[PDB]
């Protein structure tokens, strides 16, 4: 299973063949232009919104899969082909696809024509550059057509897949010169448009689709390519598209460039007319004048090149394995920095159609992104509390387009609000500025009850302790963590929702995970009470938190292993009593992070339970057995076939917590043996049973009861990167901010003779090389900084922009 | 123009070419299965709601254009081909294709081989039955492979087309002998499912569509057809399918037939499991052994044909025109009683993923099937008027799956009430059963505050009394009969609604539609006022239709031509002083109809105007001259482009209006003459610009002002066939049901010599034969009955059961 490699020094990964398990793809864009691009060339582009504004069309679930995308023809004496070798599928002499930071490129050859483009979203741009280079690597002179193609969308992808009696009769485009203007309802509320343009003079031009393909033709074939010439179609109606056709004239080891741009521009509404039916283009002009060279595209892609190193280079490190390098040093970073910037809008798994992303969600990627963009974490923390009820309850789902909660899902997910402090406490230890703490924040969105952030820790904090079951232990709600463990549901509706809809009072069902979440926050809150100057506060949060851990130890162990929950008949689940579901992962991660059982031997013996029963060669199963029919009291958990999603489903997510409790107990072996089980390096091996990105970490893997035990799904969104890297990079590896600096404290393979790490840290670098001389797993023997032993593992802060040199000695 | 031709004799449409202007397609099913099927066998089925029971998945708006259906391949020695030429596409030595009543056939040949296939959902059955034939017309042995094939759905379209990221883990199938069986979600909540059956042993299967198809294959060369063996795939999770192989031999000039069945089983939640994970197949085996042979489906197939003919036989034209006796003995009704039995649901333009049929197309469908199913259109008209709101206004959108009005969608729309007097008006005409006027008929579908049936009908009247605007004319609303012309919106955000979110008061902008329309209701409501002895009451209507007629003639008349509306400003719409839009054609028939203008010349000038101004080779037009920019205070009519839609493009639904209301001032040759541009067989031999189904209406035709002027959209579910029908039969062949009984009053060209209408009335059938001897348009000279002059025109009620020969002479 390999169908490419690494390539570190450029920080890529090469697709070799075009025909891998899955289509593989990658992002382009940082602030609002963004597209999907597959390694055929396939996908997508929208403006901030891939549900309002999207620009192309894309077709899911599609047979051939991932058709439709940004298309070039190579037209050659009759034959032709792509060099993405897709759509049109004939065998390439040579074909290589390479994912980088922000950008992509696909070379193809046939007969002596090789074709070579590079995809990217330029900083500051709102647009998608495609740099193009011919060469003719034959012997004879040539002449040949080339085109270009792409779908577009009306602006609406609902609409634009549903309400066809309507918008079969919107579609409007403008040519002029080498352009091609995307217009629909811009006579009407519209204020915006989209256009294709090249840096060259065209001889001929396609805007209707009908006209380019024809109507029983498809992507692999169009009639238009076919006889080698465009029919200057005009669209109107039906499906507008984009099109252009070049004749070139190549002598051999003759090579031309073009520059291909899709670009978006929004005009002000006493500007959008140049004159009666003529769309303003002074903007279009100006964005097509800044890319017409290539000697501007590739200063542009130096720039993002540059760009993206400095989003990398806080975090370094150099170890004697280099998939651990790999994915710490380039891939894992990246992934954080794609999902805060998309959200969990649109892959090739998320249709782009939903309106937001989960509150938990966006405070766990925060953990993942703090150290790489502290000020912009402060601002999405701040917008973030700014949606939270007075009562202390988030809505969950979160709306970062609009910085809104839904009002229509609500706000019932009993561990909602403890991420808050999570990432609070996260933020405050990445930069120490509690300042974040007096900052003002409105209620609800509402700046009449606004209050400061520390009142929001403090709501979010006492909704737990206002929502305690009968054992002491906080109600569930409709979901925790588990978003398909729904307790008080009860539906028998096929169509019904399960999270949402709720038939039981909610008074009963208790959940042993936010118990542990609580306990394992309360240390941050009360760690900010002190602070705050607050006091008796502080120790009345204390009481609470101890009240929490005695619960915990009398009703929430089982006597090998963590409960999980109570359902609404006050029947234990995760029980060795139970027939199915003996035992869930979730309830011990957290136990043990909180350090409850570490003296009694109770964490431990939950550790090796879970090594027992959830253990598999692809990771860690959500809970053991499986369940192999419906069990109503028990909501959507149960409803999947045994493996798959959360019915003993593989989450890199929750299997990053069982590593951090594995160092916790001090046990760096298992911990390391867990994290390589997951981490995508070192699965690369074995893609054609991964099947998906060989790069990104992916939601799921098919558990051991499943047939295709080892296949993921949904890749490329999800929050397990964040808790993956903070696993490995601070629990492991031992690099952990605290309030008062940064402590070294790693859990490592007792045979790692050591490793270094260059941390950017609060102003200042520090070059921290680790020692195992006695070959330990845990414990700290010395700490010198700048050739002089400290006290303690706390390094001292400098704030003075300088390099200091760090020697830890374990043992 | 040609891609076929009618065949009368078996009431059929031949398609000749497989490649028409557009997939034309055909429904089957009357009671709970339906299907769309395509000339190629493209389509899909559901079990009475496209969008929550959908059986197998279909893509709209694909490249290429209709992929996806009941594909059989033969293969023969390497090379192979489908019977409806698609998806492979390879040239067939012949291909034929059928569209009858409730059934399609295809047939084509290739090699020595012929495959021909019947389609159809049989009578109080669950499914469609496909009848396989396949021939060895050469001269040589044949050892061939059939395979069939059909792709499931998840049960919900919508969640089937975005929720990949949990439905990509649930498909699940069942394989026992010959049957595969379509479980997903069968074990959690779901108590139906799906199967695919053939009545022979099997050589092999497919389940998987990556097993069969291939990632990276189309439909059009599936690995396992190319490889001409099954691989036995069984789903799980992605994307279920469906697939027979069976190998045959055949000796020159044998053939074998073939039975396939795709099935739909409902089980009760007591009756779900023969045993743990084994669905319960009972109903299933009952199913399969209905069809298991060819003699049992041929005579389901003649029960059907029996089914359609006594559905079609209440009224027979004979005339000299053989286009007219097709359409309205055949096409209109059969397109009637296709509304009836589908909504506004599922076609090729509409995707099947709303909620309901407007509540003024319901009413309005009546009109057209009231002589086919009286007593199905008493129980429709009871339905609808449950839902009507105590104030007397209605829903916009009706649920006839639920029986309910959709809440979220608003009430707001001032002309929706008066249809149901006109629905009810019609029923009673046509069947004289009063009864039901005294039915308890609840309001708001709550049985606490029901009252009658003529109780409603007066609410809906009093409804336009109590909303006058202040020129003493209805206030519009959101919207009238045109939805598209939106007076109190002035939106300015797109996705924003323009019929349900309005931002004026609503109290200044008035319709002249809706006046004329309430004048022409009020003869019915003030006939029924007094029927129920309500003497006092209807002296009072009579009096609000009398003020209504001087209010129109006082501020609805613009010298020529009836204006059409008033917007918020107070301002003329559909006058000459306008700059565009100087009249529109919604305010003319009704005006007319209602007999406004008659004696003073105003009807007709009206009508010299929009001959003048509005018509085209293809019908007339909505409004001249067209809009050319947004007109912000006129709503959506003006957000499309010139000659589309409602922005000056021509509806068959409005023409029929305009057809009546020629009639009504006597000129009949107008009047056909109008009825002859749109009438689908009219237009047969311009098919390539109709580009349409040539045997049913479409809902709009490009208008003089677009390029693609005479181009169809929206066709096969839509209002225009009823009241198309009704002008046809009753207002110009003047065969009009009454009070009384059936008057006899024809408006026909003056050329004409007679024609024959034999007509099941109340119990009865008339032969009525019209001669005309000194060529006149309209007047009756004389009628007989069985022998003997009557006085007047209307034809006395015998409901004996017999035949009674009428004459009737005109002059």
Redesign the interface.
């Given at each position: 299973g390999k169908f490419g490699f690494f390539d570190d020094a450029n920080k890529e990964y090469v697709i070799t063949v075009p025909?891998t398990p899955?289509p593989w793809i990658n992002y382009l864009g940082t602030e609002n232009f963004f597209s999907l691009i597959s390694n055929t060339a396939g996908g997508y582009s929208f403006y901030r919104d891939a549900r309002?504004r999207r620009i192309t069309r894309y077709?899911?679930?599609?047979?051939?899969?991932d058709?439709?995308g940004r298309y070039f023809y190579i037209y050659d004496n009759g034959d032709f082909w792509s060099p993405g070798w897709?759509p049109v599928?004939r065998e390439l002499e040579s074909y290589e696809s390479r994912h980088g930071l922000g950008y992509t490129k696909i070379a193809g050859k046939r007969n002596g024509i090789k074709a070579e483009v590079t995809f990217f979203v330029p900083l500051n741009y709102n647009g998608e550059v495609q740099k193009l280079i011919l060469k003719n690597e034959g012997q004879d002179k040539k002449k040949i057509t080339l085109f270009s193609f792409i779908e577009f969308s009306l602006?609406?992808a609902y609409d634009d897949?549903?309400?066809?009696?309507?918008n079969?009769?919107?579609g409007?485009v403008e040519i002029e010169g080498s352009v091609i203007y995307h217009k629909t309802?811009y006579?009407?509320?519209?204020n915006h448009y989209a256009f294709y343009s090249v840096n060259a003079k065209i001889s001929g031009f396609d805007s209707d689709?009908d006209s380019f393909?024809?109507?029983?033709?498809?992507?692999?074939a169009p009639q238009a390519v076919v006889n080698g010439k465009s029919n200057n179609s005009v669209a109107?109606?039906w499906?507008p598209i984009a099109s252009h056709s070049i004749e070139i004239e190549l002598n051999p080891g003759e090579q031309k460039e073009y520059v291909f741009i899709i670009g978006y521009v929004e005009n002000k509404d006493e500007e959008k007319w140049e004159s009666?039916?003529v769309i303003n283009k002074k903007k279009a002009y100006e964005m097509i004048e800044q890319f017409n060279t290539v000697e501007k595209v590739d200063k542009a892609f130096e720039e993002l090149k540059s760009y993206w190193n400095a989003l990398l280079s806080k975090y370094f490190l150099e170890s004697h394995d280099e998939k651990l390098n790999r994915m710490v040093n380039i891939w894992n970073q990246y992934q954080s920095m794609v999902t805060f910037n998309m959200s969990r809008s649109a892959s090739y798994?998320?249709?782009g159609?939903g309106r937001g992303m989960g509150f938990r969600d966006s405070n766990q990627d925060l953990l993942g992104f703090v150290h790489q963009i502290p000020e912009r974490a402060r601002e999405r923390l701040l917008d973030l509390a700014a949606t939270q009820l007075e009562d202390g309850s988030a809505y969950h789902q979160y709306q970062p387009l609009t910085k809104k909660g839904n009002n229509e899902i609500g706000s019932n997910f009993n561990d909602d609000p403890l991420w808050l402090i999570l990432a609070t406490a996260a933020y405050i230890k990445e930069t120490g500025d509690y300042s974040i703490l007096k900052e003002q924040v409105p209620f609800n969105n509402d700046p009449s009850k606004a209050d400061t952030m520390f009142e929001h820790l403090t709501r979010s904090f006492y909704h737990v302790v206002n929502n305690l079951g009968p054992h002491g232990l906080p109600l569930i709600g409709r979901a925790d963590w588990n978003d398909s463990l729904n307790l008080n549901s009860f539906?028998?509706?096929?169509?019904?929702s399960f999270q949402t809809t709720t038939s039981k009072d909610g008074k009963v069902a208790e959940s042993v995970m936010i118990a542990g979440m609580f306990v394992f926050i309360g240390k941050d809150y009360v760690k900010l009470s002190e602070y705050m100057g607050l006091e008796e506060e502080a120790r009345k949060a204390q009481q609470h938190i101890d009240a929490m851990k005695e619960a915990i130890l009398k009703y929430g162990y089982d006597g090998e292993w963590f409960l999980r929950a109570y359902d609404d008949f006050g029947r234990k689940v995760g029980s060795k009593e139970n027939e199915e579901g003996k035992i869930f992962i979730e309830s011990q991660g957290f136990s043990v992070m909180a350090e409850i059982g570490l003296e009694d031997g109770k964490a431990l013996k939950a550790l090796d339970s879970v090594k027992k029963y959830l253990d598999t060669p692809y990771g860690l199963v959500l809970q053991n057995p499986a369940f192999?029919?419906?069990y109503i009291e028990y909501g959507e958990i149960?409803?999947?076939?045994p493996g798959?999603?959360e019915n003993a489903g593989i989450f890199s997510h929750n299997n990053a917590w069982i590593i951090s409790a594995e160092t916790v107990v001090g046990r760096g072996d298992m911990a390391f043996d867990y994290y390589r089980k997951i981490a995508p390096a070192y699965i690369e091996d074995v893609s054609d049973i991964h099947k998906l990105e060989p790069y990104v970490y992916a939601?799921?893997v098919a558990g051991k009861d499943?047939?295709?035990h080892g296949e993921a799904?949904?890749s490329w969104l999800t929050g397990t990167a964040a808790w993956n890297f903070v696993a490995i990079s601070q629990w492991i590896l031992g690099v952990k901010p605290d309030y008062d600096g940064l402590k070294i404290d790693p859990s490592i393979p007792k045979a790692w003779d050591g490793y270094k790490v260059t941390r950017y840290f609060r102003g200042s670098t520090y070059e921290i090389t680790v020692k195992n001389p006695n070959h330990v797993s845990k414990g700290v023997a010395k700490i010198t900084v700048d050739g002089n032993e400290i006290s303690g593992n706390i390094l001292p802060v400098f704030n003075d922009g300088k390099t200091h040199k760090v020697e830890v000695i374990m043992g």
């Open positions: 025909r899955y309002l077709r899911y679930n599609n047979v051939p899969i058709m439709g897709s599928k602006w609406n897949m549903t309400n066809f009696q309507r079969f009769s919107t409007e309802e006579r009407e509320r519209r689709r393909i024809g109507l029983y033709n498809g992507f692999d109107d109606g499906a009666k039916g798994f998320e249709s159609i539906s028998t509706v096929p169509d019904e192999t029919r419906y149960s409803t999947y076939p798959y999603k939601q799921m499943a047939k295709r799904k949904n």
